[PDB]
Amino acid sequence: LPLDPLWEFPRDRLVLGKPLGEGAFGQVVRAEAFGMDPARPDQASTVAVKMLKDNASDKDLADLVSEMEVMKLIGRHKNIINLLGVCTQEGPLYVIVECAAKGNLREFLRARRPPGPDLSPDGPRSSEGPLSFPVLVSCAYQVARGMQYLESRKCIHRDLAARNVLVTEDNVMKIADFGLARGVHHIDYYKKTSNGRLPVKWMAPEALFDEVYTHQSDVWSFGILLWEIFTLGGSPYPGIPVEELFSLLREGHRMDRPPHCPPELYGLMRECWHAAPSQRPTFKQLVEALDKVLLAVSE
Numbered sequence: 001l002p003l004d005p006l007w008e009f010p011r012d013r014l015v016l017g018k019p020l021g022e023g024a025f026g027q028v029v030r031a032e033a034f035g036m037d038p039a040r041p042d043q044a045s046t047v048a049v050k051m052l053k054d055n056a057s058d059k060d061l062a063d064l065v066s067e068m069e070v071m072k073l074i075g076r077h078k079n080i081i082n083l084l085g086v087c088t089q090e091g092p093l094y095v096i097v098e099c100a101a102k103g104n105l106r107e108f109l110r111a112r113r114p115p116g117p118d119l120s121p122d123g124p125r126s127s128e129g130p131l132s133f134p135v136l137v138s139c140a141y142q143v144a145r146g147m148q149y150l151e152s153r154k155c156i157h158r159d160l161a162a163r164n165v166l167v168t169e170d171n172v173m174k175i176a177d178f179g180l181a182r183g184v185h186h187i188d189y190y191k192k193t194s195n196g197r198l199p200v201k202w203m204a205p206e207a208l209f210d211e212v213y214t215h216q217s218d219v220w221s222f223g224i225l226l227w228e229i230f231t232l233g234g235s236p237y238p239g240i241p242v243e244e245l246f247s248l249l250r251e252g253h254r255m256d257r258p259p260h261c262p263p264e265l266y267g268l269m270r271e272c273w274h275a276a277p278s279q280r281p282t283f284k285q286l287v288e289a290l291d292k293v294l295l296a297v298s299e
């Protein structure tokens with residue numbers, strides 16, 4: 001690999017720490033960076049490091065190198081996992097990105113579901129869950145903002161889900177893994193992830209049936225993400241096996257309106273799930289529509 005002085009960071013200024021998980025595109029590892037700001041050489045900062053496994057092919061290297069160059073080109077936005085630096089010299093390939101200490105949005109929501117009535121009343125709010133409606137709207141808005149930026153940078157996140165949206169310490173939404181070479185030509189539509197996810201339930205019809213991805217494919221996926229948000233991490237198409245998902249999509253079946261969800265947002269969901277991709281809202285339109293809702297419920 002060639003030296004890029006613009007993004008190059010001394011590997012000795014990185015202290016790797018407890019792994020965050022591993023997948024087809026390598027492993028993600030939490031780490032501390034010293035002097036990520038060149039103005040303050042000794043200041044510590046908390047980052048995340050993308051790397052390869054011990055069992056990696058030269059294809060896996062090319063894939064990670066690919067993701068590196070993608071992040072170099074897309075630039076900074078508050079609502080995406082930004083590239084901070086890289087380590088390409090005299091050691092293993094480290095791609096240093098931002099950290100999101102609160103984990104992915106799905107787990108974030110599932111951990112903060114309101115207490116069931118089986119718990120005894122203790123305190124003036126003992127029935128008041130961590131998550132309120134305006135905050136849930138804000139999460140949706142932040143994801144839409146970032147996706148609109150990614151679209152303007154001509155980037156198609158072909159898997160957009162609550163699982164791939166990370167939450168910072170300050171409860172800021174950040175889109176992750178938007179530059180992966182996801183290998184769309186060989187998707188096992190039936191295989192379930194180790195945590196039980198069936199990624200096919202986020203795929204737009206033209207992507208699932210015709211292998212076609214556009215920015216409107218992500219708008220569809222964003223519509224599913226909206227469903228995830230207002231079910232507080234619920235699994236889409238509940239109880240429906242992949243085989244039944246196939247025929248239901250061909251009939252044009254859509255998810256019902258989830259409980260405790262206003263018609264304004266289920267409306268946006270159904271707009272994102274329109275058959276013709278040209279009749280789904282753009283990400284710019286989603287931002288504006290979600291903004292009006294957010295402004296309405298905030299005094």
Ligand SMILES: *C(=O)c1nc2c(cc1CN1CCN(C)CC1=O)CCCN2C(=O)Nc1cc(NCCOC)c(C#N)cn1
Pocket residue numbers: 020021022028029030031046047048081097098099100101102103104166176177
């Ligand atoms: C940041 O590295 C970080 N991220 C996560 C956790 C902890 C930390 C760092 N950290 C903060 C303070 N605590 C007390 C100590 C500490 O180590 C733990 C929760 C989960 N984090 C996380 O998911 N970070 C994360 C993950 C990423 N990958 C997403 C896919 O997971 C494989 C990415 C990226 N990209 C960025 N951050």
